[PDB]
Antibody
Framework: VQLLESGGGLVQPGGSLRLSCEAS????????MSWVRQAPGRGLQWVST????????NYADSVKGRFTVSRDNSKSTIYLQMNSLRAEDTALYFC??????????????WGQGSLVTVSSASTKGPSVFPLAPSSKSTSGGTAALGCLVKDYFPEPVTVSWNSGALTSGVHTFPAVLQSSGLYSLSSVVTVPSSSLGTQTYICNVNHKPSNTKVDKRVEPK | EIVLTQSPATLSLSPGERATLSCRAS??????LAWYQHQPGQAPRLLIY???NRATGIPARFSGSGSGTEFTLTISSLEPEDVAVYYC?????????FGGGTKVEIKRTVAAPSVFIFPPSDEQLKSGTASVVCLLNNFYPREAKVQWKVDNALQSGNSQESVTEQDSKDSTYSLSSTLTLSKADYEKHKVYACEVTHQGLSSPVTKSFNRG
């Protein structure tokens, strides 16, 4: 069973945005469905619930009159249509399935989250630079290498290595907000020094708000 | 609303230890109380519902108790994968509410960082900026002092750090410190050095390169 969310991204303050959550592996019509959000650095907040019929909706006070929750059982999808957005609405939005139809929780399945960023700043794709391993007579038996992903807005960026074939030893750091208002992060991996002449290392960088996809080869020297 | 207050806000204990997490409600919620685990950047997971009922597929080390206004989540023997924020949640009344969370940290044995330093790439220098990166890899505890020196002058105000979440299998951290300079400033100086102080190191360790 899965909940697949879509619709996240950058939206202007005062703007509207619709999130959707598609059920797979269970009949949507049989369960109450909810939206729960996590603002940056804060906890979980319930936003809305829809029961079996479109008219059985409940809302947090701070979204009543602005947000509408609804369902289309024929398409196995739940929706959250948002209006008049403000910075306080910036958050990771989860959809959540109830164990039953007649009560809104416990929430026994949650979507992966869609990030909604409410801001007037423009989208900007990152520049990708190599963090090259040391390959000299004098370096050690383990090599570190990486990619620096600099100057992008909004979050998020995702990074993989070798199209996902390399996972062990990878660390992708949380982004930092720079003085410029743009984000930057690095992704690193440790590998055997003996592999550097033999094995290609490529970081795969995706920034969907800017339709940026970058494969960068990271080599010694 | 029914306010849920969790304590302690943070809890640091070693694998194998018993962990007791508290949730207090401002008015009775009967047994209409559930518990969720949230591990970094994964979807939340139901652990306990109806105050005491273990959800399907959840390990037996997790248990819940209580009623009315006082509830507890117990992890009888902690495992490294239990690093997470844990939340309680009531369904007695609208609005549905959550507590503020208890962050559980796994207290492993001391591990010194493996330190690496990276010069700026030639590609970046074309842009007019130079980023120098120092990596502290796979260490515990989280506290670490990183100092940048350029031609043996201590730098202040021109670096930013980032730290990973605790690893779910080995409970270590990694940390990056990025020094940002003008290309012109970078090309003026020769020796770039990151000095690391950490409880796992008997004396500070320095990694350096010479520009060129």
């Amino acid at each position: 069973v899965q909940l697949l969310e879509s619709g996240g991204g950058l939206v202007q303050p005062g703007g509207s945005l619709r999130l959707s959550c598609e059920a797979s592996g269970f009949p949507l019509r049989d369960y109450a469905m909810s939206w729960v959000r996590q603002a940056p650095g804060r906890g979980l907040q319930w936003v809305s619930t829809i029961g079996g019929n479109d008219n059985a909706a409940n809302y947090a006070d701070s979204v009543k009159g602005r947000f509408t929750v609804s369902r289309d059982n024929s398409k196995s999808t739940i929706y959250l249509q948002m209006n008049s957005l403000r910075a306080e609405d910036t958050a990771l939005y989860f959809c959540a399935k109830s164990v039953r139809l007649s009560r809104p929780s416990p929430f026994d399945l949650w979507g992966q989250g869609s990030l909604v960023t409410v801001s007037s700043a423009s989208t900007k794709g990152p520049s990708v630079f190599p963090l090259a391993p040391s390959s000299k007579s004098t370096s050690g038996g383990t090599a570190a290498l990486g990619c620096l992903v600099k100057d992008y807005f909004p979050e998020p960026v995702t990074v993989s290595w070798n199209s996902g074939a390399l996972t062990s030893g990878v660390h992708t750091f949380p982004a930092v907000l720079q003085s410029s208002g743009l984000y930057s992060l690095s992704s690193v991996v440790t590998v055997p020094s003996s592999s550097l002449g033999t094995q290609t290392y490529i970081c795969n960088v995706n920034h969907k708000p800017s339709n940026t996809k970058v494969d960068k080869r990271v080599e010694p020297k | 609303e029914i306010v849920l207050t969790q304590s302690p806000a943070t809890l640091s204990l070693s694998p194998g230890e018993r962990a007791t997490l508290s949730c207090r409600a401002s008015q009775s919620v009967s047994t209409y109380l559930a518990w969720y685990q949230h591990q970094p950047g994964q979807a939340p997971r139901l652990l306990i519902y109806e105050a005491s009922n273990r959800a399907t597929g959840i390990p037996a080390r997790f248990s819940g108790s209580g009623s009315g206004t006082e509830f507890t989540l117990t992890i009888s023997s902690l495992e490294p994968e239990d690093v997470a924020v844990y939340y309680c949640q009531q369904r007695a009344s609208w609005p549905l509410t959550f507590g503020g969370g208890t962050k559980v940290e796994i207290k492993r044995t001391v591990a010194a960082p493996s330190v690496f330093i990276f010069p700026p790439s030639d590609e970046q220098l074309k842009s007019g900026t130079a980023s120098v990166v120092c990596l502290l890899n796979n260490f515990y505890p989280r506290e670490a002092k990183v100092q940048w020196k350029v031609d043996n002058a201590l730098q202040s105000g021109n670096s930013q750090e980032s730290v990973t979440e605790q690893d779910s299998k080995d409970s270590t951290y990694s940390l990056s410190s990025t020094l940002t300079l003008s290309k012109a400033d970078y090309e003026k100086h020769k020796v770039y050095a990151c000095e690391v102080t950490h409880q796992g190191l008997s004396s500070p360790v320095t990694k350096s390169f010479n520009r060129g």
